[PDB]
C-alpha cells in the first residue's frame, strides 16, 4: 500500500509455488504428455545424429584418441 507498509505474508511464497509440483523422486511418471515423450528420437533418426556428431567432433575425437595413447 501507499500508507502503512506492505504485509509480509499477503504476497505469494516460492514455497507455495514448489509445493504445487510433485516431489516423487522415483515415479517422475506424472509429467508425461506426448511432446515430452517426443524428445527421444528413434533408430533411423538417432543414427543420423551419431553420424553427424562424429564429423563435427572428429576434431575433438582425435585428441581424445591420443589421450588413449598417453594412457597406454
Amino acid at each position: 500500500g501507499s500508507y502503512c507498509p506492505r504485509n509480509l505474508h499477503l504476497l505469494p511464497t516460492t514455497d507455495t509455488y514448489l509445493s504445487k509440483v510433485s516431489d516423487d523422486p522415483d515415479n517422475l511418471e506424472d509429467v508425461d504428455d506426448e511432446e515430452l515423450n517426443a524428445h527421444l528420437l528413434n533408430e533411423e533418426a538417432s543414427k543420423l545424429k551419431e553420424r553427424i556428431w562424429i564429423g563435427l567432433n572428429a576434431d575433438f575425437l582425435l585428441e581424445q584418441e591420443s589421450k588413449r595413447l598417453k594412457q597406454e
Binding site: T13, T14, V21, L28, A38, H39, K49, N57, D59, F60
Partner: protein, 180 residues
C-alpha cells in the same frame, strides 16, 4: 509500495545421482548440443514449461529458465523423464533453487549520481562503464540494479519473499532520489 517484482528468471540445481555418459544422452533427444571441446555438458532447451538446463556426466544438471517455481521444478522434472526413458537409472534428488531474478518499473526517472553519495556505502556507480547503479544489500543479501529510467533488476535471492522485501526496503529511497 504499490509494485511487486516480476520473476523473469530462476535457476534450478538438481542431482540425478549417477555418473552417466554424455555421448549417449545427446544422441537421444531433439535438443542435443554436445560440444565437449566447448562446454563439458549437453544442452536440452525444452518448450513447456520453457527452460534450457545443462546436464553433467556426473548427473547434476543446471536447469536455468523458469518464470516461476511451478515451472522450475517441472523443467528439471522433464529431463528426469528423458534420461530415464533413454537407458539410465537416475532419480530426481535435491531440487535446490540457487537464484531467482526480479524486475519492474517504478514509473519515474531516478537519479543515480546522488544515490552514490548517501547510500554509497552499499553502492558502486560508474556512469560510462555501466549505466546502472549496483546496490549491494545485506538483509537480505539480494543485489539490485537501479537504472536511470526507473527499472530495477533484483537478482540474488533463493526465496521469492526475499526478493519482494528488497523492493519494499529500497522504495522510500527510490522515492527520495528522483528527477521532478
Amino acid at each position: 509500495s504499490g509494485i511487486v517484482p516480476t520473476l523473469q528468471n530462476i535457476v534450478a540445481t538438481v542431482t540425478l545421482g549417477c555418473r552417466l555418459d554424455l555421448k549417449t544422452v545427446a544422441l537421444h533427444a531433439r535438443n542435443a548440443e554436445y560440444n565437449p571441446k566447448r562446454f563439458a555438458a549437453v544442452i536440452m532447451r525444452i518448450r513447456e514449461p520453457k527452460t534450457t538446463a545443462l546436464i553433467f556426466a556426473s548427473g547434476k544438471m543446471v536447469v536455468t529458465g523458469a518464470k516461476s517455481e511451478d515451472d522450475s521444478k517441472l523443467a528439471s522434472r522433464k529431463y528426469a523423464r528423458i534420461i530415464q526413458k533413454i537407458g539410465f537409472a537416475a532419480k530426481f534428488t535435491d531440487f535446490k533453487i540457487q537464484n531467482i531474478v526480479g524486475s519492474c518499473d517504478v514509473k519515474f526517472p531516478i537519479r543515480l549520481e546522488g544515490l552514490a553519495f548517501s547510500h554509497g556505502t552499499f553502492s558502486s556507480y560508474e556512469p560510462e562503464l555501466f549505466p546502472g547503479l549496483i546496490y549491494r544489500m545485506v538483509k537480505p543479501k539480494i543485489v539490485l540494479l537501479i537504472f536511470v529510467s526507473g527499472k530495477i533488476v533484483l537478482t540474488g535471492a533463493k526465496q521469492r519473499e526475499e526478493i519482494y522485501q528488497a523492493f519494499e526496503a529500497i522504495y522510500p529511497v527510490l522515492s527520495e532520489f528522483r528527477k521532478m
